[PDB]
Amino acid sequence: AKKISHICFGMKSPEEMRQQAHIQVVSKNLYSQDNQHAPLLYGVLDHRMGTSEKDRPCETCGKNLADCLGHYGYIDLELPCFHVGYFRAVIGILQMICKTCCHIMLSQEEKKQFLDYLKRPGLTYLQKRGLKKKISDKCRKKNICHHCGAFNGTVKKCGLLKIIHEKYKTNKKVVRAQENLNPLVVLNLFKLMNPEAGKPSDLILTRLLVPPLCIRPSVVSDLKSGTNEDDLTMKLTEIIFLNDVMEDWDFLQLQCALYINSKRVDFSGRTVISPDPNLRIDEVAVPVHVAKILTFPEKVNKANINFLRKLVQNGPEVHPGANFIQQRHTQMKRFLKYGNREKMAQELKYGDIVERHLIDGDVVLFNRQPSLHKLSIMAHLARVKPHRTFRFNECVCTPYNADFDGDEMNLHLPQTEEAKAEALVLMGTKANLVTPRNGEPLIAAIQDFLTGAYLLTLKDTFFDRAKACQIIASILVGKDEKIK
Amino acid sequence: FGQKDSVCGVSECIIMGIPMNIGTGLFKL
Amino acid sequence: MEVKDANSALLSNYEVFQLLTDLKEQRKESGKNKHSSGQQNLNTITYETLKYISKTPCRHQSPEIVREFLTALKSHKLTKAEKLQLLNHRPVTAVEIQLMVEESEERLTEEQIEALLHTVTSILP
Amino acid sequence: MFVLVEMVDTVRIPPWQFERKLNDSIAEELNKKLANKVVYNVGLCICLFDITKLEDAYVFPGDGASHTKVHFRCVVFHPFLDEILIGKIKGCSPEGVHVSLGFFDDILIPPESLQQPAKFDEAEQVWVWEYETEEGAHDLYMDTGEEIRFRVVDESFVDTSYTLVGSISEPGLGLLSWW
Amino acid sequence: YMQRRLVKSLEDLCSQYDLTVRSSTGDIIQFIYGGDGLDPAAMEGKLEFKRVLDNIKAVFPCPSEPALSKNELILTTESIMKKSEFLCCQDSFLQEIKKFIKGVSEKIKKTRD
Amino acid sequence: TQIPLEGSNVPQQPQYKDVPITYKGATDSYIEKVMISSNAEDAFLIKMLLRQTRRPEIGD
Amino acid sequence: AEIKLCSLLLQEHFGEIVEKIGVHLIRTGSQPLRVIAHDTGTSLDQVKKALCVLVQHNLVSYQVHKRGVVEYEAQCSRVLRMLRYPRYIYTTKTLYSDTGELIVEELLLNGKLTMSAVVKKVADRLTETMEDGKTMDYAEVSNTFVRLADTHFVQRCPSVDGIYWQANLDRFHQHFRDQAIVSAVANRMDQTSSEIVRTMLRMSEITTSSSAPFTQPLSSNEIFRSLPVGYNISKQVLDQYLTLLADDPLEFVGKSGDSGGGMYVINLHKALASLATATLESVVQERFGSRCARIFRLVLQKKHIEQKQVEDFAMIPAKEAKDMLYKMLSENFVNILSAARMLLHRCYKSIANLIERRQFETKENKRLLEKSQRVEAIIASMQATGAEEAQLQEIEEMITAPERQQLETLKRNVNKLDASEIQVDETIFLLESYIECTMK
Amino acid sequence: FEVDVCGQCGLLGYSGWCHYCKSSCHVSSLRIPYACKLLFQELQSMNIIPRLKLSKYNE
Amino acid sequence: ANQKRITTPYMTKYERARVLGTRALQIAMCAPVMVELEGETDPLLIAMKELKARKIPIIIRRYLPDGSYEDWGVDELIITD
């Protein structure tokens, strides 16, 4: 129907955040401390609250480990604390609200600026606060061209401190809790203008909410030796002593700042490269012990079942075979060291899905660095020849720099047959020989083919009907050429 | 400050894992 | 998941009953093994609905009685609800409609409802 | 008369029958996931009678299944204007007495919605009809399965419990042992 | 740096069927690929007037000879040419822009002959 | 497995989650020396000469 | 909280779209119809209807901005005045008769209406209230209209059978302040003090706004010229008690003479601070206890910072003394401006909770109004014709005893929550008067 | 993974009956790598605009 | 939907290769199987069998965001050449 079409980051939806609440602060200790054991406790680091161990009742998801999407829960602490980011904002923009009046930003005006703001794209409303960056609280209260000047308040850059005196300005400063202002008046004055998205009020650092435990792994040693986790925002549970309760707000926000604010790989392989020219230009070949690398869909089809069962009976230690085959009932069964299997009811036991080895393309991809062209990874065939090199028709070493120091090379494995057919017949025969970046062939006699063929062409060389021998590696030759 | 981010092009698509939609990936029967 | 219009029908009642019988006899046709494990409870609803329908006196007869109960009531300012009730019971007797059943006497002024009473006696059990 | 409902849901046509017969297969697909208990309000294991149109039958970007949607009509049993039927007493309970009509299964009936003197005798879990007519204490002892000509008002879908309530105590007739 | 930055900055370019490029909001970048509509994929020998002469050199339809000074016969073939790609048109603007220069090229071929 | 504080009493070594030291590659080694090299603390090493005579092949 | 309270009020009084647009204009300030429809996603006709409802109820005040299309903006306090419509109309019943009650009710809900419109509407409306006839005319209504206008309560709207009128909330707040101060002097002194304070306040209404910090001195010679009819206190008694209130730590009216003839001045700011402390004491007694009120009274002449004295007033060991000081600081009960504004925030949230609770008691049982109306219609049709007791017995089996008792319980809870709303609304009026008065 | 998540009373939870919010109208089942979900989580602490919506693949 | 005039008498190679891919999935789920059902009879080469289609009775519809639905039957136009 519809997958993602327009998505951005995620946050705390407070409702679904807090129905999954189990415990905020059970006691002074956690991790089943006082039990002198560790059955499963205490109700927040366990069950779930975010599925960070082998199994427990996953909340709104299930089951372990993945597909238990991060579970939420109210772990509120209610430690007095405020907006550190808006601490800095208030310090910088110097009381942008014009506290404690919060009068209308503009007056009449000139509605030209009004309609210009209302009929322009976003990322622009900062100009209103820029206009009132300085004039805020130093102006005529209830006047034209703005409504600020109330009430003589400018903020001081005393670090994270926001000291708001009834400034002249520059003539009313004090040093030790006098001439201060509380962020609660800022909160009330909320209660650049857009509360649809830009709400500083709800970001108050008093109803702090936690990301789920899917961020944090805990390496329980099965030995009770080290269970470190990172970071995380729940750690302030140990401050229950101060949880009972202007410079005090600065101290609280300083304590907060400690722990509040600041297509890779699939189905791969890498070995060394030393090729053959016996591999027809489209074909390539891999090692043999890449067939020991598996767990392929190759979903069974009706015309295929018998040809699949032929290799299904082989198992773990035969090249043309099968292993770990995905069963009909979503419970895949192995033919590896626990195999002792392959009775294989001939139409149903894997009637959905099978998984074989590299028999014939079955395309594979080859990696290079740096990938100068898009023709440094191309589509080409298989089957299969041993001696774990990266062998391929040596006329196409140019767009790979398949350098021959013996420095290794990377192989892919694509296990999805949707655009695999599309890939194999679009960038397999037209990608190689013709580039749009230059218009010049990449495939070419790299070396001695050049001089060997040259020497053939040299007006000297006269041959024998007995030298129909060398003819016959070419046009009386390997697969797909034996006409006369 | 509640300001949006401009990482919403198409190079994000590979980290975000969605089908491409331009020229031919915008099928509307 | 999603639906748009939740009321898009005004049809013949006993016709809907026989069509539910047809739905019952058609769902059981899906007894083949390929389509057996997937969906079967439609059989269950068809059978239970047919059982409750058999409880009703609405059986043994045709949807022509529906057009009777329409043409004899909508022509005398009766609402769709009253004839709807009278269809859902399919009155066994005539005086049923008058005293054993209600809201079916005055909109015809107890004069032409007698014709529907005679029809009910003629066809309905 | 039974209400047809326009419905729009995902249709997953398997590739097994991409070229085979369509219309009846489409109907089977529609009946696939419209089951009794919980799909939507109002919907419970029901079907169609006429077509309207068949919209975009996509496959996928490149994946297996299909992306067909629904334009059809769904034969629901909406709770109508108290349509007169026969209501068999489905069960018994101290809170209320269960009834069966034909729309849903569970039909709660409060005590006073029984005959006004007839109470629930929890000493025997029987809603004995204290049929206090003709001045007589005629206790019509009828357990689960009491004959009552029910007509119901409502239907429910969301709560932890398909529960109904058919309003009884007809002023024009009374005699809830029959009506 | 510059390779990854060029790749990171220049993905949205597409080639929708109106012969015109479009952008994240479908804003026109081009209308043709330089009149020709061509791109360097099929850059055959010199495009495509000298190598193809050799291509048809190598498959010899023997029956013909110089009797009528075929230059005029070459002009008649230019006429059947003028007819045979005025049925040109499709996704177009790629043949008329060069059809007359084609004609001029065969005309100079006839003059040389 | 015994908690250093006054924790569980029973873990007086029935609680072994054995930690094997096993790994190798896709060819036979040959254990050639075994070492109990123990500094002044009994922190037993096991030094081992896992020799693998990989004579050359296409690619070396 | 504040805007949440405004939304709850607007939903209670008028409807949904009106409340939406009022909240939106409170948040965003000045905005014309088009951007309002763009941001709120509401059709233009509904936006216009809701805005004209707001203007009719004098909620949204609009000024013609520069480029000739009308913008709109709402004031949070103006919508918080939707709290006081019950209180406005009730105090109208208090000060003047039911005719003035209907005048103010129409000007606050029926909104802008002319002299002819208001006068004739209420005149034809009040005829049915009295006995059959009595031929009550428009002339007396117009006379009461003019009289109440003279008292500044209801003023003719300026122009931006006419012409429209409205109620001046400024004089309503002035009357509230006068009544509150009279009651405060009554409940902190004897009734003589409150009556004398009333004597001072009698001629200080139209020359004084709703946020003035002090009133005019009143010479005792004219107070003897204007002796109270209910208090025939002589010159000696009046002067002695006024000068005693001058040399009174209460200071509800004070000397500023020397020379005479007695410049007795009521200190509005000091009395307002005393009333704020008394309301804080009441809330402390209710939730945090009466002994916390005792420590409040103790530390009235004490800290904040530093911490080196409060244990003396604690009288109990220093551990819990320091704990009580820490909870005094944490609760932000001293920055008087910030603490008082946060207390106003507490009362905003409290009335929001009370109105939401009343919404439950009036709406969660909404599947009862139709039943009650049908039963009442049955009773009306039964009492006149067919008064048999069988129908009464059937109704009693229909109105079961649990049903009637839960109806009484929900009505009782509605009344309790309404009274709580009204008490905390008086508290919010005091707090907002402080907020508009503490501004310096 | 076609996990279920949306903006209208929905988050990273079940598909058929979301114990987070089983509104039954907000089922999405969107293909997404777990990296974006980790971004959701780690940015829950560091507040930022959480835009979430869908669109039709069809006409 | 006769807005089919602005395509060369050829489908593009990208569209053709991807329709071959989706026909691969088709003939790889159970069967839409075609002119020769399994005359080409081979083991697990899923793709390389429906490449030999040369008829392809299916429709594909190509667009532009500021344009309508330029539709095309596979039959009615020329092939990869």
Residue numbers in the entry:
A (entry chain N): 12 to 186, 213 to 228, 239 to 292, 307 to 323, 359 to 580
B (entry chain N): 1334 to 1362
C (entry chain I): 1 to 125
D (entry chain J): 1 to 161, 184 to 201
E (entry chain N): 870 to 915, 919 to 985
F (entry chain M): 836 to 895
G (entry chain X): 4 to 163, 231 to 403, 426 to 532
H (entry chain M): 1075 to 1133
Please, what does the article write about this entry?
Pol III is a multi-subunit complex composed of 17 subunits. The TFIIF-like RPC4/5 and the TFIIE-like RPC3/6/7 subcomplexes are Pol III specific and can be regarded as built-in general transcription factors that play a fundamental role in Pol III transcription initiation and termination. A notable exception is the subunit RPC5, which in metazoans encompasses a long C-terminal extension (RPC5EXT, ~450 residues long), whose function is currently unknown. The RPC5EXT is formed by two consecutive tandem winged helix domains (tWHD1 residues 259–440; tWHD2 residues 556–708) connected by a 115 residue-long flexible linker.
Here we describe the 4.0 Å resolution cryo-EM structure of apo human Pol III. To obtain a high-resolution structure of human Pol III, we isolated the endogenous complex from HeLa cells. Hierarchical three-dimensional (3D) classification led to a reconstruction of the intact human Pol III from 25,369 particles at an overall resolution of 4.0 Å. The core of the enzyme is characterized by a very detailed EM map where side chains are clearly discernible. The RPC8/9 stalk and the RPC3/6/7 subcomplex are more flexible than the core; hence, their local resolution is lower compared to the rest of the complex. Interestingly, the coiled-coil region of the clamp subdomain within the largest subunit RPC1, which is in direct contact with the RPC3/6/7 heterotrimer, also displays a high degree of flexibility. As can be expected from the high degree of sequence conservation, the overall structure of human Pol III resembles the yeast counterpart. The deletion in the jaw domain removed a small unstructured loop, whereas two deletions in the human RPC1 foot domain result in a rearranged, more compact foot structure. In human RPC4, a small deletion removed a helix (residues 269–285), which in the yeast RPC4 protrudes back towards the Pol core and contacts RPC2. Deletion of this region may therefore highlight a weaker association between the human RPC4/5 heterodimer and core when compared to the yeast enzyme.
